[PDB]
DNA sequence: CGATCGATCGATCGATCGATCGATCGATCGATCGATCGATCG
DNA sequence: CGATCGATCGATCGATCGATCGATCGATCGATCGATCGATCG
């Protein structure tokens, strides 16, 4: 949509890994069926004994679900933001 | 509310240098048919039409070319007879897709353009 | 003498798929129309 | 000089079969949770 002139960076897939790690920790994302904090010690024992597939599959293919739906983003995100126009489908 | 809008249909808008169309959706026992019967019997030269009772050339006038004078002639149609009036269509859902298709130009541009062998012209409806 | 741990099995949630069916959009073979002219007749 | 059937080929419509698609019944293994238990050492 920016016209070409007669004679914005796409960040590398490796650099985006840090951004993904940041967002996964700040709980904007969540693993597909993440139970999260278990209720009691016995449940924590059975959880730590088991090995979830989501922790074994590669960083690029872990399934996630979203906590802030796009509508909430359009409510919150300022319209002065460059990427705001994409808060709609 | 049904009374007002259908009355507002008879009043109409204001054409300038205007028609209002209404659809009735409801269970098949509530006063739908009776009002449409009244409208075409209270408006000048209204036409009563149904889904299977009409065709694509039912609302559209059959334009043909004369066999001796070779001029263009028209044999009238439901949407041509009721020019300036009100056309009542029952079972508007059950209208054939081909018949339903030609409504778009009629409802928005009030014209019927036909392009067939030897005939290229547009009408007003 | 018992307290800690790493492995195994049964059971269950669920995410998914194959077999089957009737319903929706469309290609297209068949019926009809039409336009000029020709052959028979008055 | 005019009126009545005939054959042909393009053009149009339409109806019929078919291609395409969303849905449910039957199944099942991927993922996980908990119980079982054999093994290890304070
Ligand atoms: N609100 C109403 N006022 C008067 N008559 C009504 C009303 N609702 C239903 N009816 C009666 O129910 C019948 C429905 O017939 P009609 O509306 O013509 O076709 P349909 O049965 O398809 O709706 C009419 O004969 C009408 O007298």
Curated annotation (Swiss-Prot), chain A:
Subcellular localization, as worded in the UniProt entry: Nucleus
Transmembrane segments: none
Superkingdom of source: Eukaryota
Function: Component of the origin recognition complex (ORC) that binds origins of replication. It has a role in both chromosomal replication and mating type transcriptional silencing. Binds to the ARS consensus sequence (ACS) of origins of replication.
Additional information: Present with 2170 molecules/cell in log phase SD medium.
Family from the record: Belongs to the ORC4 family.
Description of how the protein assembles with itself and partners: Component of the origin recognition complex (ORC) composed of at least ORC1, ORC2, ORC3, ORC4, ORC5 and ORC6.
Protein name: Origin recognition complex subunit 4
Gene that this sequence comes from: ORC4
Residues of the full protein shown: 425 to 529 of 529
From Swiss-Prot, chain B:
Outcome when changing residue 32 to A: Loss of MCM2-7 complex helicase activity
Superkingdom per UniProt: Eukaryota
Subcellular localization: Nucleus
Residue stretches making up the MCM domain: 1-125
UniProt binding sites for ATP: 26-33
Quaternary state and interactors: Component of the MCM2-7 complex. The complex forms a toroidal hexameric ring with the proposed subunit order MCM2-MCM6-MCM4-MCM7-MCM3-MCM5; loaded onto DNA, forms a head-head double hexamer.
Miscellaneous remark of the record: Present with 8800 molecules/cell in log phase SD medium.
Family, as annotated: Belongs to the MCM family.
Purpose: Acts as a component of the MCM2-7 complex (MCM complex) which is the putative replicative helicase essential for 'once per cell cycle' DNA replication initiation and elongation in eukaryotic cells. The active ATPase sites in the MCM2-7 ring are formed through the interaction surfaces of two neighboring subunits such that a critical structure of a conserved arginine finger motif is provided in trans relative to the ATP-binding site of the Walker A box of the adjacent subunit. The six ATPase active sites, however, are likely to contribute differentially to the complex helicase activity.
Protein name: DNA replication licensing factor MCM4
